[PDB]
Every structure is written in structure tokens, then in C-alpha cells.
Amino acid sequence: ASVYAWNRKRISNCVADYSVLYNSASFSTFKCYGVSPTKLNDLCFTNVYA
């Protein structure tokens, strides 16, 4: 989508594997604010907004 009309997808009721994203070499920026990438794969959240 365009940045003015950015797409928001709500992610619920599944298992989110963050190590697949973190260990990928295809991403230039993976800057996390407020949480560290190492403990993302352990913690649990109510909803994820993408």
C-alpha cells in the first residue's frame, strides 16, 4: 500500500515465529523499540498489528 493509505493487518490466534524474520539476511532494518528481538520468540501478546 501507499504510505498515506498504509495497510493494517491484525494478526491473532496463531504462533508467531520471530526468529525466522530476525535471522533473515533480506532485511536492511530490523530496529525494535521497547522490546528486544531475543525474547520476542518467548513472550505472548494479545494481538499483533502489521
Binding site: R10, S12, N13, N47
Partner: protein
């Protein structure tokens, strides 16, 4: 033939969807218990 669904008119903001296997003189007796505890 089932060809009439009139239960709703709209669906705006969904939080949870779950599709499962079917649960189902009077011949069948179906007992259900529904509880709302801690969400």
C-alpha cells in the same frame, strides 16, 4: 436444500474466526454447557 440464511445484515470488525468439525419421535439428545471464565 438449504437456501435461506437470514441471521445478520453486516459484519464490520472481526477479532477471532474458527472453523471446525461439525458437533452434531425425538432421536438425538444434545447437551451443551457454555461458560465465560477469565475471557
Amino acid at each position: 436444500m438449504e437456501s435461506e440464511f437470514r441471521v445478520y445484515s453486516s459484519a464490520n470488525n472481526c477479532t477471532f474466526e474458527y472453523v471446525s468439525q461439525p458437533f452434531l419421535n425425538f432421536k438425538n439428545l444434545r447437551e451443551f454447557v457454555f461458560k465465560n471464565i477469565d475471557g
